[PDB]
Scaffold this motif. Sequence first.
Motif, PDB file in Angstrom:
ATOM      1  N   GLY A 115      47.484  43.410  49.606  1.00  0.00           N
ATOM      2  CA  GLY A 115      46.793  44.321  48.707  1.00  0.00           C
ATOM      3  C   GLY A 115      47.504  45.661  48.607  1.00  0.00           C
ATOM      4  O   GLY A 115      47.617  46.237  47.525  1.00  0.00           O
ATOM      5  N   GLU A 116      48.065  46.126  49.721  1.00  0.00           N
ATOM      6  CA  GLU A 116      48.724  47.430  49.724  1.00  0.00           C
ATOM      7  C   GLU A 116      50.178  47.363  49.249  1.00  0.00           C
ATOM      8  O   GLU A 116      50.655  48.316  48.610  1.00  0.00           O
ATOM      9  CB  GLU A 116      48.633  48.033  51.139  1.00  0.00           C
ATOM     10  CG  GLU A 116      47.183  48.444  51.456  1.00  0.00           C
ATOM     11  CD  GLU A 116      46.638  49.454  50.434  1.00  0.00           C
ATOM     12  OE1 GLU A 116      47.010  50.642  50.495  1.00  0.00           O
ATOM     13  OE2 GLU A 116      45.874  49.051  49.546  1.00  0.00           O
ATOM     14  N   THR A 117      50.902  46.265  49.538  1.00  0.00           N
ATOM     15  CA  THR A 117      52.300  46.202  49.108  1.00  0.00           C
ATOM     16  C   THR A 117      52.400  45.961  47.595  1.00  0.00           C
ATOM     17  O   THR A 117      53.307  46.495  46.937  1.00  0.00           O
ATOM     18  CB  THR A 117      53.084  45.123  49.889  1.00  0.00           C
ATOM     19  OG1 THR A 117      52.446  43.828  49.762  1.00  0.00           O
ATOM     20  CG2 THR A 117      53.180  45.496  51.391  1.00  0.00           C
ATOM     21  N   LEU A 118      51.491  45.157  47.022  1.00  0.00           N
ATOM     22  CA  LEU A 118      51.475  45.015  45.569  1.00  0.00           C
ATOM     23  C   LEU A 118      51.161  46.344  44.899  1.00  0.00           C
ATOM     24  O   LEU A 118      51.741  46.683  43.854  1.00  0.00           O
ATOM     25  CB  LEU A 118      50.443  43.976  45.130  1.00  0.00           C
ATOM     26  CG  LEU A 118      50.642  42.546  45.629  1.00  0.00           C
ATOM     27  CD1 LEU A 118      49.421  41.707  45.239  1.00  0.00           C
ATOM     28  CD2 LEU A 118      51.979  41.939  45.109  1.00  0.00           C
ATOM     29  N   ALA A 119      50.249  47.119  45.498  1.00  0.00           N
ATOM     30  CA  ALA A 119      49.861  48.398  44.899  1.00  0.00           C
ATOM     31  C   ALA A 119      50.986  49.432  44.990  1.00  0.00           C
ATOM     32  O   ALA A 119      51.178  50.218  44.055  1.00  0.00           O
ATOM     33  CB  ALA A 119      48.573  48.930  45.555  1.00  0.00           C
ATOM     34  N   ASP A 120      51.756  49.454  46.097  1.00  0.00           N
ATOM     35  CA  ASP A 120      52.899  50.381  46.138  1.00  0.00           C
ATOM     36  C   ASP A 120      53.926  49.999  45.095  1.00  0.00           C
ATOM     37  O   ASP A 120      54.540  50.872  44.461  1.00  0.00           O
ATOM     38  CB  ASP A 120      53.594  50.374  47.492  1.00  0.00           C
ATOM     39  CG  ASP A 120      52.903  51.251  48.508  1.00  0.00           C
ATOM     40  OD1 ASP A 120      52.010  52.052  48.117  1.00  0.00           O
ATOM     41  OD2 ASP A 120      53.270  51.136  49.708  1.00  0.00           O
TER      42      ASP A 120
ATOM     43  N   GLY B 153      49.464  56.179  41.018  1.00  0.00           N
ATOM     44  CA  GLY B 153      49.653  54.880  40.369  1.00  0.00           C
ATOM     45  C   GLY B 153      49.290  53.707  41.258  1.00  0.00           C
ATOM     46  O   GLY B 153      48.747  52.701  40.792  1.00  0.00           O
ATOM     47  N   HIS B 154      49.614  53.799  42.553  1.00  0.00           N
ATOM     48  CA  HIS B 154      49.160  52.796  43.510  1.00  0.00           C
ATOM     49  C   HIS B 154      47.639  52.640  43.463  1.00  0.00           C
ATOM     50  O   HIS B 154      47.118  51.522  43.342  1.00  0.00           O
ATOM     51  CB  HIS B 154      49.660  53.213  44.893  1.00  0.00           C
ATOM     52  CG  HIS B 154      49.048  52.486  46.059  1.00  0.00           C
ATOM     53  ND1 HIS B 154      49.821  51.936  47.067  1.00  0.00           N
ATOM     54  CD2 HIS B 154      47.760  52.330  46.448  1.00  0.00           C
ATOM     55  CE1 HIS B 154      49.034  51.427  47.998  1.00  0.00           C
ATOM     56  NE2 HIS B 154      47.780  51.645  47.641  1.00  0.00           N
ATOM     57  N   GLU B 155      46.903  53.755  43.567  1.00  0.00           N
ATOM     58  CA  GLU B 155      45.439  53.676  43.506  1.00  0.00           C
ATOM     59  C   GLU B 155      44.967  53.091  42.185  1.00  0.00           C
ATOM     60  O   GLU B 155      43.981  52.342  42.148  1.00  0.00           O
ATOM     61  CB  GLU B 155      44.815  55.061  43.728  1.00  0.00           C
ATOM     62  CG  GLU B 155      44.914  55.525  45.190  1.00  0.00           C
ATOM     63  CD  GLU B 155      44.311  54.503  46.145  1.00  0.00           C
ATOM     64  OE1 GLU B 155      43.161  54.076  45.898  1.00  0.00           O
ATOM     65  OE2 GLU B 155      44.975  54.100  47.129  1.00  0.00           O
ATOM     66  N   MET B 156      45.665  53.413  41.085  1.00  0.00           N
ATOM     67  CA  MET B 156      45.285  52.908  39.770  1.00  0.00           C
ATOM     68  C   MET B 156      45.259  51.384  39.741  1.00  0.00           C
ATOM     69  O   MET B 156      44.417  50.791  39.065  1.00  0.00           O
ATOM     70  CB  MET B 156      46.257  53.402  38.703  1.00  0.00           C
ATOM     71  CG  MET B 156      46.010  54.794  38.198  1.00  0.00           C
ATOM     72  SD  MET B 156      47.017  55.089  36.716  1.00  0.00           S
ATOM     73  CE  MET B 156      46.555  56.787  36.429  1.00  0.00           C
ATOM     74  N   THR B 157      46.202  50.735  40.444  1.00  0.00           N
ATOM     75  CA  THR B 157      46.265  49.273  40.365  1.00  0.00           C
ATOM     76  C   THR B 157      45.048  48.624  41.012  1.00  0.00           C
ATOM     77  O   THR B 157      44.764  47.454  40.735  1.00  0.00           O
ATOM     78  CB  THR B 157      47.535  48.677  41.033  1.00  0.00           C
ATOM     79  OG1 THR B 157      47.469  48.851  42.460  1.00  0.00           O
ATOM     80  CG2 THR B 157      48.864  49.294  40.471  1.00  0.00           C
ATOM     81  N   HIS B 158      44.304  49.357  41.848  1.00  0.00           N
ATOM     82  CA  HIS B 158      43.109  48.763  42.423  1.00  0.00           C
ATOM     83  C   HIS B 158      41.984  48.576  41.418  1.00  0.00           C
ATOM     84  O   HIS B 158      40.961  47.991  41.775  1.00  0.00           O
ATOM     85  CB  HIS B 158      42.635  49.611  43.584  1.00  0.00           C
ATOM     86  CG  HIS B 158      43.540  49.515  44.755  1.00  0.00           C
ATOM     87  ND1 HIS B 158      44.202  48.350  45.070  1.00  0.00           N
ATOM     88  CD2 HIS B 158      43.908  50.428  45.681  1.00  0.00           C
ATOM     89  CE1 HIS B 158      44.915  48.538  46.165  1.00  0.00           C
ATOM     90  NE2 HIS B 158      44.761  49.789  46.539  1.00  0.00           N
ATOM     91  N   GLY B 159      42.130  49.071  40.195  1.00  0.00           N
ATOM     92  CA  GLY B 159      41.160  48.698  39.193  1.00  0.00           C
ATOM     93  C   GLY B 159      41.424  47.343  38.572  1.00  0.00           C
ATOM     94  O   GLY B 159      40.616  46.857  37.785  1.00  0.00           O
TER      95      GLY B 159
HETATM   96 ZN   LIG Z   1      45.730  50.906  48.161  1.00  0.00          ZN
END
Ligand SMILES: [Zn+2]
Length: 650
Positions: free
Chosen positions: A547-552, A486-492
């Motif tokens: 970028g990483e804390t929003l995605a987690d 789900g974290h990776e998904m938010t990078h779209g």
């Molecule tokens: Zn990430």
Amino acid sequence: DDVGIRIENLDTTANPGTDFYQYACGGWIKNHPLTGEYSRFGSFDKLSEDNREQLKSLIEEIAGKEHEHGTVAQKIGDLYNIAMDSTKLNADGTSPLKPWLDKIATLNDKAELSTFLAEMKLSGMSPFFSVYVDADVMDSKKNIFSTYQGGLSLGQRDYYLEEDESTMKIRNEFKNHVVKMFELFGIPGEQAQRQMEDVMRIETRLAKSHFDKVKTRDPYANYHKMTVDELQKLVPNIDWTKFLAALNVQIKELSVSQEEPMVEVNKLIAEEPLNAIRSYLSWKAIDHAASYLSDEIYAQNFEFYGKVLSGKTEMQPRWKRAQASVNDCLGEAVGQLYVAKYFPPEAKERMVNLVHNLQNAYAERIRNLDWMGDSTKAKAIDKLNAFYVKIGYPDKWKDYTSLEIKKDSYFANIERAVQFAMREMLDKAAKPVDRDEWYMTPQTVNAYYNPTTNEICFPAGILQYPFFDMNADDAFNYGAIGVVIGHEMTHGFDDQGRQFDKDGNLKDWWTASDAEKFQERAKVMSDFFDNIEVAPGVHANGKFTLGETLADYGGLQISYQAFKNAIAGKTLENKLGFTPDQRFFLAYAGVWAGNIRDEEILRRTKTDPHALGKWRVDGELPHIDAWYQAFGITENSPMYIAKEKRVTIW
Ligand SMILES: [Zn+2]
Ligand SMILES: [Zn+2]
């Protein structure tokens, strides 16, 4: 199913509302001391080590018995065993390269180089320059054939040009190395000297024309689209029609990534006599073959590239080099037997269903965002449902029938394997981009969402404990791999993903309102992390890791919601005394279990765009309402923050 989490990982003297990471992972820390060679060691590193032993054991097991001719097992086993048959390698000497060296000696017309250079490319050599086929960075649904600066044995231009005494030593070691190698191939000393000088002269001229690696990394600036006949006018001393026909490439346009090195190749072909060109091509053949022949030739190769260029002191044992050959040149074939042993179809099917549940939960959350307008929500949902989901191993496996492995020579098999790989790459020039082709092998321990292709790739190699356990229940797997995916998904869909449409083409699809309100929500997170002390008197960089804390944060809310949907209407059973909701968050924390040195905490804070393992847990969960409910976290808990202060971006 199994609980997945393990008591040995916990530190139950910690209070979950004071240091949840310590509660969930402090035992892991205690039980995995750093050895001395590592500054950081976490459960991702432990898995990577476990995975390399799996491949070693797998390939040896395959090689230990005979298999039906033509199966991937026969190709793997035979390639490994012929790589290991040192008595034959040493008895054969340089003879496996005699056809190439004889062929080069028959060159008698500079015009023949157009076909000959293409033939060398098919066997894995790149005299003068490189070529490759990949998605067009200006048109992501189509492939483009590109040339690239190349032709250097040392790889980097600075070795040929810098005049300091340290680099001069490397150059003179290379000169001595080239002479010694020619002599190992039976070239008389006087001829080996002359041919080494040809090699150095030619590669030094190429090096002068190359750009620094800094300048070549941007694929949009290192791009010059032109017709074949336009390249024919730019570099007239290669017949590009013949070169491309020999590659079996039928195209109207291509990209010259760097034009100046290609113009230098044109001048080199014009100005150097053909005998000097033959020296250079013979060197390219010898240098490429040097790992695949006798021990004496390998030892000399290592003396230069290993000891001089890399500062290595000892060569790897043959078995490690044989396994690398098999894994690097039969990668997806190994993948077939890897997943047959470790990742069955039922595991792939469970993970594909899990990813689809995460997609459905994410779509539900996108509909409720208060920073996205309605038209943007519709575009986001459409892009999300258009994800290319590549989980476990391919739906479309490479066909290895045309790759013949047999007991003639190690070098001849390596050559057939490279020819197979080159043919497969070059065949794409005529075709539209196929997003069902895997760029990673199934046994790889890596995973990402790719913004430029809208694909999410999680190979079987990473789908192992502590991320995914086919034997564990949904609480464990959603809390672990489910949050990671789900974290990776938010990078779209975040500040990076909003620059790409669902085909991977450049398009900014956020409105101005979307952008303003996103940053408003994101500032809540960056301010929060700014105030974390990762060490006494040392604060986290909330903007740098945003970028990483929003995605987690997003992965936590997405996977938790999907988890509750997946277990809806089933009986809750506590395991190890924990409710399913509690296990979800314990499994999440375990993904980031790790040991880190004090100095490594400081440096990663300077340089690493990911938050540290501990604050990926302790700085994220206080923003997740479900975590408060799961562990009874109240206003009196040190980690508590009030509802109205929690992040709401996903
Ligand atoms: Zn990430
Ligand atoms: Zn469960």
